[PDB]
Amino acid sequence: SIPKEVKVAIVGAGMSGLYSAWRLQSEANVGDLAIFERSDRTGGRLDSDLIEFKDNRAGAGSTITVKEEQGGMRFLFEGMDDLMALFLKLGLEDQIVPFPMNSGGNNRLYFRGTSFSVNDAEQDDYHIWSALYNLDPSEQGVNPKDIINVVFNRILQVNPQFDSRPEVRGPEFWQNFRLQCQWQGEPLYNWSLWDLLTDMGYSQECITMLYRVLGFNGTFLSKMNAGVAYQLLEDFPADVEFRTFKDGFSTLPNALVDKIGKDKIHLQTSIDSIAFDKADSKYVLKYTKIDQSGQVSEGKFKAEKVILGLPRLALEKLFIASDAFKQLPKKRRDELWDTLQSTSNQPLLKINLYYDTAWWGTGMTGRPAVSFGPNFADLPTGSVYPFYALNDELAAALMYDERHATPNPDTQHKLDGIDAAKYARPAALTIYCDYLNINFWSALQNKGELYHHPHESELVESIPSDIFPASEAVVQQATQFFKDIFNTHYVPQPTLTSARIWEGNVNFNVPENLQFGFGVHQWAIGANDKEVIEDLVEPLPNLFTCGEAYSDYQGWVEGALRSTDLVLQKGFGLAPLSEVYEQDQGRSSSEAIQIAYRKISNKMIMEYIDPNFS
Amino acid sequence: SIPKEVKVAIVGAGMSGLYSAWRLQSEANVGDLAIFERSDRTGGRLDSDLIEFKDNRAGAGSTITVKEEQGGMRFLFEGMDDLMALFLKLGLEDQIVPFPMNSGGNNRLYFRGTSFSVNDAEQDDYHIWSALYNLDPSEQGVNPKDIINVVFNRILQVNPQFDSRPEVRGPEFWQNFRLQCQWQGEPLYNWSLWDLLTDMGYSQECITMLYRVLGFNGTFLSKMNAGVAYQLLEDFPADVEFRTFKDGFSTLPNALVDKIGKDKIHLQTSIDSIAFDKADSKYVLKYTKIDQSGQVSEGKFKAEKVILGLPRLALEKLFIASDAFKQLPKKRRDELWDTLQSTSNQPLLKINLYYDTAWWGTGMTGRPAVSFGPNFADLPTGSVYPFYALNDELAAALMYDERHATPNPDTQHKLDGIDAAKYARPAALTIYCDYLNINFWSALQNKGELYHHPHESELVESIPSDIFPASEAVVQQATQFFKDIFNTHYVPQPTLTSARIWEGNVNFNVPENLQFGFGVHQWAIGANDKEVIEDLVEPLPNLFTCGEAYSDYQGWVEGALRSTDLVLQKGFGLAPLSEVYEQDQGRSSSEAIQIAYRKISNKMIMEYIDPNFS
Ligand SMILES: Cc1cc2nc3c(=O)[nH]c(=O)nc-3n(C[C@H](O)[C@H](O)[C@H](O)COP(=O)(O)OP(=O)(O)OC[C@H]3O[C@@H](n4cnc5c(N)ncnc54)[C@H](O)[C@@H]3O)c2cc1C
Ligand SMILES: Cc1cc2nc3c(=O)[nH]c(=O)nc-3n(C[C@H](O)[C@H](O)[C@H](O)COP(=O)(O)OP(=O)(O)OC[C@H]3O[C@@H](n4cnc5c(N)ncnc54)[C@H](O)[C@@H]3O)c2cc1C
């Protein structure tokens, strides 16, 4: 039942739409709102899967669960102040577990037909990179990612007017970095990273090594500017401690939906166009709803305020079709369309292949065991990430591991058995790539017949509805690249698969459950995002825009939250959540989350790993 | 003066718009037509430049002229039957000169930090490719482009139902190739080239070598399908004899404009939207004209028939804004928009750097002289093509060269002096690249200040208005890549430059003289172009579409001509020009053009090279 009029109409049940409604209900006493979501699910670019595997090893109708992610998978305790505050207010801190990013040097690298480990690559003064790439003398004998770091240091050095001193380098730091720093008199947001390194004298061989070794090449080869490219590249230090939720990032939007109420959320309801009723000072919203039968139904309704929690492509579609934008004078209407062009569309994809057991441990490869983190390659694969069945003991061991503790022999021996035991349980690999590698897989995914392991029903309970299977061709090609990357003859067929290509669609032939926006966005060459961001808060009276795409912290949920906060401030008087958290708690969400996690971690370690722990 | 009503309104003064008007006037007695062109020039993606250089060598106000191309540059006597017929009917055959494509093995190759010649690369069983790329055994010891040829032969072999016997492989052959041939049960237009070679077992190393060595990578890395990719790859045999016009491809549209009349061509007149007056059964065309002052003026007019000689992006803009398309029922309107999505947009660019003398001959490099054809590199440069000052003796020598004749010592000695003399005259290099390399140069072109050689006025007479200079950064980076490619310390600053980025624009901030459509187009994955082509001839009653973008022969003027012929047939009863030519002449345009050129060539050779010639 679509209401006749609401105080606030929220378009999009992604993080920014859900977060808007939750903060409005809770902090502004707005009860007369509704969320309108075109797909059959909440959460947008957060999309977890919990697959329940039949426990089929000899000594066992018991079940084992593998969490996977089709969208976002990780976050940080620092520099994500709205997100941390949001976790604490929803009481989700007790579900936070490690997201480890290395295997002590055993992670795989595949470049120019050669398979090797992270440890192999450091040997002999990083010799392998000098053998694989025709590098200049100043480009040899250094860890490739330290070239990125050094260049960053040089940028800071020639911009002394630019502060460069906060030990938490957050969105304001990164905005000022790309808008204030220059190289050779031109500011970084007028530079592409590719041009920049070239102008600095780097060989094309070295540049190619850099964009292949990082597994994501849009920072180099797309239309994003160098300044925002560096915000992304200096998000993955070596000393990263990422975290995630045990049951997946979807924990967060699901918790938001519990607080909001399913009755105020209208799924399978696309907002087609928007007009303004000058008589009663109300927006009018054309929608198309799809019943559970499939029975389509068009309709209209009114709203005092409209919040568009939507990325670039969806805003463009709305803009084109909406009288509210057309009735605008040509100058301002053109200026608004141009402003939408200021953030680049970054396609992403995740292909998840699930296995009844893991085959990349030492028992199956005869080579040093691969555990956690990205396995990078200049193959279309881009990056490959392992996922394991949920296991409390494993999570405690990983919590122990992220401490600087030095286990005694008995603790180390229990850790060893725990590390090895995860290979005997169901597990999965994610293929995760961007820009240049998208087209290899999309053509593959849409060709021929889809993959299904025979007797699927006999091993996997139910298959979630958000899972669309990988094509047979995708599985075939992924399997061959896995043999390359993991240097092994043995890669079995998967028991379950999923393909998700986060690439914007403009074809009417596409089923609803296959329409996805662009994976992420990043500011383009020439974008003054300080001007663009403020222009997009409230582009018409009482019609608001927010989300990741035009945010402070593109790539991340925190961007959606901070962008939405600007709407919540200007249209409703709400201060930023992180600042509201601090005044209510007497400390920051960062400090609070660190302390709470330390307590949960300590208890997990003493319960599962070392009863006599520090 | 914009007329009140016309019988036929032609939108676009590219080849398809000009060709439509010329054939309608001449063969259908339609005098009440007009052409409406948004830019300040005719010809669209054909754009020649004739630069007149002050003759400043010691023994000389005499002038020397360098032809260059910002768009199309070459054609073939075979497989281009409309174009040949068109040349003959306009009497342009006497201006046809060779477009040579090699330097007897001295052309340059730059791959993975290494500079070498075509002759070097064949040495020792193509050893250099095995040293530069980590190739499989079945990929070593063969000329890279012969891998493309072999794979093509294998495709033909497993499709015996597919004829594969015409010795002129024309657009019908290539359409049936991509729509009828299959690999592993899936037809070629559902395949990407990248997926195809991978599925055939080629290494990613070999695939990368292939798309770098060919200098154009969209065939591999874009959304075009494998079948149409092969139409393009098997357009450049080793035994190519391309030709061009002495004064550039612009010779052709300029000749069309002479026949049509400047009074029926309305420059700086964009067609904004289209509606249908149901009362008088007429289309109504909203336009925006720009006076010579710059004084804008909106207006409207009517037309009985409308011919849209426009590519994908321009048709999309019209479609969105036009009541004639909006009043369409949602099913057919969506189906039409989807049909527009079936051809991929291929960006291209040409950057032309002019020099007072050529510096890539042996006198300046100390290395074997580079003459004609593409110098390929895995640098952003893609391909580099030399152009020389116009010289009758040089053209005759090149005409002699394309024969299989074997000069005696005195003829060879005169040829030697002619080959060497072109380096002492003004010359130019074109940087010509596609897909993956576009973003490197666009960011460079729009950064910082534009390039101007001091005392430009003192060396170049007038600068044509279609010339926009390369940025200083573009020149800087091109100069360094030239030192790499040509293996030389010495690359001087250019005397004149031009940058043309054939990449579709959707920003209102762009001056008119910087708005260009996509360089070329190619059918996408899943496009049944036989259905798409016929759907796009006359999508609404008396409103027609044609041009290269949705044609039989994408990439080439012949595609525009053949697409337009379909409009001329269905809306006006005109048979294809090539068939009209044959009935009027008693032979084909191919045979006619070969004979006429042979006569011109013979006379040039006897006049300049060998008075006693075969
Ligand atoms: C592969 C991938 C991995 C990521 N990993 C991480 C990570 O590790 N950490 C992190 O912090 N972030 C990560 N992110 C980013 C994070 O997912 C996003 O920044 C955030 O979820 C986007 O939220 P949003 O509200 O801005 O937009 P969206 O999530 O895209 O929500 C927009 C919603 O609006 C709906 N919609 C669109 N048009 C209409 C319409 N006309 N009517 C109704 N509804 C409409 C869409 O269906 C969608 O639900 C990742 C993203 C991707 C793609
Ligand atoms: C770099 C490059 C090299 C090429 N080399 C070759 C070659 O060697 N050989 C060959 O045969 N072909 C070549 N081509 C292809 C050839 O240039 C094209 O196929 C052909 O010129 C396209 O003609 P067209 O009429 O289809 O479109 P266009 O030439 O693009 O003409 C469309 C015209 O419509 C105008 N227009 C657009 N929208 C509007 C509007 N709303 N109102 C009014 N006017 C409008 C545009 O300004 C333009 O003049 C090359 C192309 C490129 C880009």
Side-chain angles (χ1 to χ4, degrees), chain B residues 11-17 36-39 41-46 70-75 80 83 242 249 269-272 309-311 314 318 348-350 432 502 512 515 517-520 546-549 553-560:
Chain B
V11 186
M15 276 306 311
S16 43
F36 305 89
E37 159 64 29
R38 62 158 170 88
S39 80
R41 46 171 307 268
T42 55
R45 284 172 274 158
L46 300 185
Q70 299 202 59
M73 66 186 22
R74 55 185 169 199
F75 47 72
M80 298 193 178
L83 190 63
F242 283 100
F249 225 142
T269 301
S270 324
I271 301 295
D272 301 331
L310 305 178
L318 264 189
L348 302 172
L349 68 80
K350 290 193 156 165
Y432 179 28
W502 295 102
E512 185 57 46
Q515 297 177 34
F518 279 95
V520 80
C546 52
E548 176 266 344
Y553 201 157
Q554 295 161 318
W556 300 84
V557 173
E558 178 78 4

Side-chain angles (χ1 to χ4, degrees), chain A residues 12 16 36-38 44-45 72-74 271 519 548 555-557:
Chain A
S16 43
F36 305 89
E37 159 64 29
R38 62 158 170 88
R45 284 172 274 158
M73 66 186 22
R74 55 185 169 199
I271 301 295
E548 176 266 344
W556 300 84
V557 173

Side-chain angles (χ1 to χ4, degrees), chain A residues 139 294 435 463:
Chain A
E139 299 155 359
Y435 199 65
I463 302 167

Side-chain angles (χ1 to χ4, degrees), chain B residues 454-490:
Chain B
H455 310 308
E456 205 152 74
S457 270
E458 196 169 336
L459 185 33
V460 172
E461 218 78 343
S462 90
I463 302 167
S465 93
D466 66 9
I467 273 170
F468 194 94
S471 93
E472 265 160 14
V474 167
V475 172
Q476 206 195 327
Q477 296 316 319
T479 303
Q480 184 54 55
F481 294 142
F482 289 166
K483 302 182 176 172
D484 302 344
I485 290 159
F486 295 99
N487 201 21
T488 180
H489 283 323
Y490 166 59

Side-chain angles (χ1 to χ4, degrees), chain B residues 268-471:
Chain B
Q268 308 234 67
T269 301
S270 324
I271 301 295
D272 301 331
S273 39
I274 292 169
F276 190 65
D277 189 336
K278 302 75 39 190
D280 56 357
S281 279
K282 251 82 60 202
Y283 285 97
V284 175
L285 272 69
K286 284 137 282 309
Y287 68 87
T288 297
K289 187 164 79 135
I290 304 180
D291 274 87
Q292 313 105 309
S293 37
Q295 280 229 279
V296 200
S297 34
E298 303 222 311
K300 261 182 220 210
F301 66 89
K302 298 166 188 282
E304 174 60 14
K305 294 179 198 197
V306 176
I307 306 189
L308 301 182
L310 305 178
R312 179 201 205 243
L313 183 49
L315 289 172
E316 292 176 325
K317 296 186 185 179
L318 264 189
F319 178 97
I320 292 144
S322 300
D323 288 310
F325 293 115
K326 289 186 270 216
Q327 276 56 83
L328 282 170
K330 203 230 192 282
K331 206 224 191 152
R332 206 234 168 279
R333 171 177 34 132
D334 291 351
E335 279 172 325
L336 186 46
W337 169 262
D338 291 348
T339 291
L340 289 185
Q341 311 315 293
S342 69
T343 194
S344 69
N345 291 143
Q346 296 296 327
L348 302 172
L349 68 80
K350 290 193 156 165
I351 294 166
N352 296 329
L353 292 70
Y354 300 74
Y355 300 92
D356 203 57
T357 41
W359 43 263
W360 49 89
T362 300
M364 293 308 123
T365 64
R367 328 201 73 108
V370 174
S371 274
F372 288 100
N375 305 273
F376 289 123
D378 66 1
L379 308 163
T381 192
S383 78
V384 173
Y385 278 89
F387 279 76
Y388 301 93
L390 297 181
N391 186 267
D392 294 326
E393 206 178 13
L394 178 57
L398 299 171
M399 280 166 195
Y400 182 90
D401 287 338
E402 54 192 16
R403 312 298 185 89
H404 288 138
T406 72
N408 65 30
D410 310 298
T411 295
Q412 183 60 71
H413 172 89
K414 203 201 200 128
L415 291 179
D416 286 345
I418 293 170
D419 294 329
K422 71 185 175 283
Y423 302 104
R425 298 183 211 110
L429 300 182
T430 296
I431 289 172
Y432 179 28
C433 68
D434 79 331
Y435 199 65
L436 173 83
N437 292 306
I438 303 294
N439 286 345
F440 173 90
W441 300 101
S442 44
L444 223 47
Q445 173 62 10
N446 293 311
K447 174 178 71 91
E449 198 25 67
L450 298 173
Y451 178 88
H452 287 115
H453 190 297
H455 310 308
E456 205 152 74
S457 270
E458 196 169 336
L459 185 33
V460 172
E461 218 78 343
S462 90
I463 302 167
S465 93
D466 66 9
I467 273 170
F468 194 94
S471 93

